[PDB]
Amino acid sequence: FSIGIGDVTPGQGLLKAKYELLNAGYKKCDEYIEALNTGKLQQQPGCTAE
Amino acid sequence: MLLFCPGCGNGLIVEEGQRCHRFSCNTCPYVHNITRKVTNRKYPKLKEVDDVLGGAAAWENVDSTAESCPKCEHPRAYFMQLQTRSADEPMTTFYKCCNAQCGHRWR
Ligand SMILES: [Zn+2]
Ligand SMILES: [Zn+2]
Secondary structure, three states: OOHHHHHOOOOOOOOOOOHHHHHHHHHHHHHHHHHHHHOOOOOOOOOOOO | OOOEEEOOEEEEEEEOOOOEEEOOOOOOOOOEEEEOOOOOOOOOOOOOHHHHHOOOOOOOOOOOOOOOOOOOOOOOOEEEEEOOOOOOOOOEEEEEEEOOOOEEEOO
């Protein structure tokens, strides 16, 4: 019963999903940054704009 | 408001004379008769209005021949103008549309 660097290596099924998920999250965060800095942000109840 | 003596530059106090109220120095003879209306407005900060109008409030600003909202092109929407801070602010305009299978909030 052994462990190794091939037991934590990511295959091809992860290095394509990770890129798309990082791009989707970064673009939605950039959209919320742009919607806070230059106009309307639909403010959640009980907090400030930031 | 603080007002200061042109002579010595100490702080003036308001007192009453035989014909008028006066701004008067405590350390020199200078007095200034209040002849006419003088004022100083603070304009403090009012409450938030964001969570106060939501949820079918008692709005009233709707009028005959009012404009339809721009998305639905129906007059099934309220619109209002309010000061958000003190009343020296120019009033901002805001509107919300509520129709069947359609919820939106606009500016
Ligand atoms: Zn003085
Ligand atoms: Zn609507």
